[PDB]
């Protein structure tokens, strides 16, 4: 296994985040997706970040 | 006492 | 001498109203990301101790 | 034996540890040294087996005062 797990952090500043994986050889650009944020009870854009 | 007789096989 | 409770078991089982013991589900510590959300959601709520293990739990918990 | 004549420090026992915390019995001995102390009243040098911590108290307490306490314990010189 060489694919590495990443976290998608909401832009709303609630601090909620999702986690997923992404291929590092391809798709260098950051991942942007519209996902539901339980804190604000709305679907917002989640931005890629680093798991630490 | 004694000394374990060695008439045993292998 | 007084019986000594198994302290490791006392930190994971609580006696309920009808004499049962509740525990949290396993498999939700550090490999949970690859598990489906439905699986994680079902593991979050508290669970009942099975009938087969009831005797073992009571032996470990004589004062509660 | 390895006993300080001023402070009374004597060997004590403890454990050698390790990165695995394995404990083995050991001994801690005082930093004893044979020194010739100048006593003004007798204008003489008297040799004492003292620890390094004992040396510090001699300056603070005075050479005569410390010897007076030793005489209360009672010993040869």
């Amino acid at each position: 296994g060489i694919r590495e797990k990443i976290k998608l952090v909401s832009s709303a500043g609630t601090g909620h985040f999702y986690t997923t994986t992404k291929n590092k050889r391809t798709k260098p650009e950051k991942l942007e997706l519209k996902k539901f944020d339980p804190v604000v009870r709305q679907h917002v854009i989640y931005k890629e970040a680093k798991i630490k | 006492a004694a000394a374990v007789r060695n008439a045993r096989w292998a | 001498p007084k019986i000594k409770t198994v302290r490791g078991a006392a930190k994971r089982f609580k006696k309920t109203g009808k004499g049962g013991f509740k525990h949290k589900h396993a498999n939700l510590r550090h490999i949970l990301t690859k598990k489906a959300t439905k699986r994680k959601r079902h593991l979050r709520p508290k669970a009942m101790v099975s009938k087969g293990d009831l005797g073992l739990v009571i032996a470990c918990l004589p004062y509660a | 034996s390895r006993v300080c004549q001023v402070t009374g420090k004597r060997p004590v026992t403890g454990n050698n540890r390790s990165h695995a915390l394995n404990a083995t019995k050991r001994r801690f001995l005082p930093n004893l040294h044979s020194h010739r102390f100048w006593v003004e009243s007798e204008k003489r040098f008297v040799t004492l087996r003292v620890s390094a911590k004992g040396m510090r108290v001699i300056d603070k307490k005075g050479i005569d005062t410390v010897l007076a306490e030793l005489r209360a314990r009672g010993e040869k010189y």
């Binding site: - | - | 198994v6 939700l28 293990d53 073992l56 032996a59 | -």
Partner: protein, 51 residues
């Protein structure tokens, strides 16, 4: 009163069966032994705190 003749019904074994841990003097496994596996009160994780 086990081990007091055939008629008693508990003779020659004392109700302990045949050559197990329960038949040994002072024999038997400790509480929570699951045959070798870590018992259920150790498979499961700790939770909560005491107030």
């Amino acid at each position: 009163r086990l081990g007091r003749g055939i008629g008693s019904g508990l003779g020659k074994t004392g109700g302990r069966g045949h050559k197990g841990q329960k038949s040994r003097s002072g024999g038997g496994v400790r509480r929570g032994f699951e045959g070798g596996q870590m018992p259920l009160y150790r498979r499961l994780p700790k939770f909560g705190f005491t107030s």
